[PDB]
Design a protein around this ligand. Structure first.
Ligand SMILES: O=P(O)(O)OC[C@H]1O[C@H](OP(=O)(O)OP(=O)(O)O)[C@H](O)[C@@H]1O
Ligand SMILES: O=P(O)(O)OC[C@H]1O[C@H](OP(=O)(O)OP(=O)(O)O)[C@H](O)[C@@H]1O
Ligand SMILES: [Mg+2]
Ligand SMILES: [Mg+2]
Lengths: 363, 357
């Protein structure tokens, strides 16, 4: 049987070879074996002890070789994981996603989720945000959407086509689609080290109709490989890879941000958006419950305005501006700002989110 | 509590760094943490699953970094395992051991044990062989579970040959037995056997290794673990942890680091293929050792492959013991040991000794 401990062992030995003898398609086939093996051991017997040993061995070996940081390997690992995912089937406005890899050791405000909601109230944009709950961070995108008043377990591959028509904003919670990421959930906790799984999230979008996306990465080293990976997983999707120089998987509200355009490169600074810089310690997460209240009451209610130099508001506005600019095919950042500001203060941003919470409520 | 998953993880993280940050002393501490975690292993628990996940990860990462093939790491690994062994206590002739790492993928005749027994028939030599080999000495009429740290001191005074079965001393190696099976890849544990001798009085030893690459680092490791032991590391170019009966063998001489080469021609023997020197299993290997080799049925000149193979390995051990490289003289003493009946008397005395325990 190809779906065996013996087949996984043979893949691990190719990683122990000098130099490593494991191809990108080998990685794909190895991950399917792992996902098969882990789906079947629902116990604390010797078989699950043996399987956990070989899965740990393989993933650790992979991490040490650093082959899991090459575009073609990341691309193939995403493909293998998607084979245990529930994909959304639709019938054929710019549709965008905005999502970071996480793993930057920052506990910043949930700015991707927040920028997705504000973008979704601009005319001609539709936002289909895919995301998860927090691993290393204090507040995740998925933690925020739940405290925002939405029952995310009602949103699945069978219910997204119902929501699709009359929503400018949608949020898809990763673990209700990706049963494969669920199978490796326990062993990832036990390993306590980063593996190939830590960078796959942004590339598991289960809706093929997304046209453009901003993908945040935690390192400069990874960004160019992640740019190439996104080309392979999302062919003919126009996409930004962003890296904040402070070490942030988002457009940084302090110092500069590099953007990989798919390889084209350009730099961003808050001043290009006509905003003051703000320390990350002023843009912190206040936990998911208080984050819901900051987003809903301070930002979405229009309590603060452009020019108030309110850090979190500025931070959400800038990241919204970049999503707009991407959607229109220009780099007029101060125009993106104006369009983001109008989405808040018109009430469009908050209505877009409320229509989503209501549409999910009626399932 | 230092002996925890959190401490082991902190060691794994140093191995993932660029470049690695795990010291040889760090490896010594990680091995004590692994040995602790494994023996206190709550069966059927999520905790068990997690421990095995972390131990597998650390050993795999250590293997991929190749730090487990560096002298100082091998030596610190052996010392960590030895903290869990029974050690033999002896008060106050050259005392030798001969043992390979295994892992050469060969299934040749048990020549280490055979040469140990023949060498123990030569005057001025005492042989305290340590190994895992262990089936052959068992089928020779020998109760190996009566040979332990408590009985070895009684056997010592009046035996020229002794055999110590590793798993009756090295309780540490027992704790990692199961994760080693599950792993199915080589780890640091694969090369520790020769460096866990429980008797500190052993003066000189031949340690065979499976690879040319490991050999030089294994020589330096032996020097760290066995300081003021005169030692030969040996590698058969065919890929053998023994002096090869076919082609060349390289020897790393650590004498308190020198390198020379051996060939059967230098012992006055013909070459033989490994196919012609195969193991017939432990039962028949004992019939062959006792009834054919030790009984004197074969002679220097018959070109009998297994006999030549044993004779050449005894001669290297004799020369090491004597502080010279007169290989042909070593063959003379080996041939004398067999045909005087001294080699067989040495084994018989050990077998009867163990029976009296
Ligand atoms: O490993 P961690 O650092 O905790 O990262 C966790 C989350 O980071 C990403 O946030 P995303 O860009 O979706 O959302 P946000 O900007 O709203 O936080 C992604 O959804 C991960 O689940
Ligand atoms: O390659 P493996 O299957 O792991 O076999 C390895 C064995 O080789 C060694 O034998 P030793 O040199 O002690 O004695 P021998 O020559 O009599 O076999 C050692 O005692 C191991 O148990
Ligand atoms: Mg983000
Ligand atoms: Mg041997």
């Amino acid at each position: 049987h190809h779906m065996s401990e013996a087949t996984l062992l043979s893949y691990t030995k190719k990683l122990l070879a000098s130099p490593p003898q494991l191809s990108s398609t080998d990685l794909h086939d190895a991950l399917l074996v792992i996902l098969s093996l882990l789906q079947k051991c629902d116990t604390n017997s010797d078989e699950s002890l043996s399987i956990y040993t070989k899965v740990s061995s393989f993933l650790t070996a992979l991490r040490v070789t650093k082959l899991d940081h090459k575009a073609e390997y990341i691309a193939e690992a995403a493909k293998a994981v998607l084979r245990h995912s529930d994909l959304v089937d639709l019938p054929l406005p710019v549709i965008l996603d905005i999502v970071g890899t996480g793993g930057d050791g920052q506990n910043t405000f949930n700015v991707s989720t927040s920028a997705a909601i504000v973008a979704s109230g601009i005319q001609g944009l539709k936002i289909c945000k895919h995301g998860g709950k927090a691993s290393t961070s204090n507040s995740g995108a998925g933690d925020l959407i739940g405290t925002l008043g939405c029952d995310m377990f009602k949103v699945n591959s069978s219910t997204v086509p119902k929501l699709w028509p009359d929503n400018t904003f949608m949020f898809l919670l990763a673990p209700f689609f990706h049963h494969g990421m669920g199978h490796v959930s326990k062993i990832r906790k036990f390993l306590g080290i980063p593996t190939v799984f830590n960078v796959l999230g942004p590339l598991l979008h289960p809706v093929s109709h997304v046209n453009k996306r901003i993908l945040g990465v935690y390192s400069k080293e990874l960004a160019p490989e992640y740019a190439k990976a996104a080309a392979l997983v999302y062919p003919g999707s126009e996409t930004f890879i962003v890296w904040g120089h402070v070490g942030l998987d988002e457009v940084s509200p302090i110092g500069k941000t590099t953007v990989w355009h798919i390889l084209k490169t350009f730099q961003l600074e808050p001043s290009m958006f006509g905003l003051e810089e703000h320390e990350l310690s002023k843009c912190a997460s206040y936990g998911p419950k208080e984050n819901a209240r900051i987003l809903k009451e301070e930002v979405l209610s229009g309590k603060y305005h452009l020019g108030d130099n309110n850090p979190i508001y500025d931070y959400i506005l800038m990241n919204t501006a970049v999503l707009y600019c991407l959607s229109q095919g220009h780099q007029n950042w101060k125009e993106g700002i104006i369009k983001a500001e109008e989405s808040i203060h018109s009430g469009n941003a908050l209505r877009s989110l409320e229509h989503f919470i209501d549409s999910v409520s009626s399932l």
